[PDB]
């Protein structure tokens, strides 16, 4: 829904805030700069930051793969309950555990 989502931080921020505040399996989503428009999932895992790019193709979201979510809050509920199904690059399977509010 909205807590972990966080318009007002920079990508180096949202580093700040999940290693100081975060645990691993904390994770956030803010606005991205790498595309506008879209959003990107800063995700903690090993003591480092992860950050996965969330498209928004104005008809679902999605992670330019994966299943598809009419909302941003969809997609992130889908993953936190789905343990698996979140994989970055190699395969490596990445958890959505605490959010970071």
């Known amino acids: 829904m909205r807590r972990w ?3 007002n931080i920079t990508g180096v921020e949202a580093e700040n805030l999940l290693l100081t505040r975060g645990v691993d399996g904390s994770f956030l989503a803010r606005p991205s700069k790498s ?5 990107t999932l800063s995700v903690r ?5 992860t950050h996965i790019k969330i ?4 008809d679902y979201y999605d992670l330019y793969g994966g ?3 009419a909302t941003l ?3 992130v509920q889908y ?3 789905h343990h698996g199904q979140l994989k970055e690059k190699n395969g490596d399977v990445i958890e959505l555990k605490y ?3």
Not at 35 to 39: L, V
Not at 55 to 58: D, E, H, L, S
């Open 5 to 7: 989502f966080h318009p």
């Open 79 to 81: 993953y936190m309950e």
């Open 45 to 49: 895992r090993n003591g480092a930051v």
């Open 99 to 101: 959010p970071l509010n």
């Open 67 to 69: 299943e598809k979510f």
């Open 73 to 75: 809050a969809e997609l």
């Open 55 to 58: 498209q928004n193709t104005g």
């Open 35 to 39: 595309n506008p428009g879209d959003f």
